[PDB]
Amino acid sequence: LASALAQAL
């Protein structure tokens, strides 16, 4: 999940 969100950056 962290990666799924972190893509924003």
Side-chain angles (χ1 to χ4, degrees), residues 5-9:
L5 300 181
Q7 67 174 307
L9 300 177

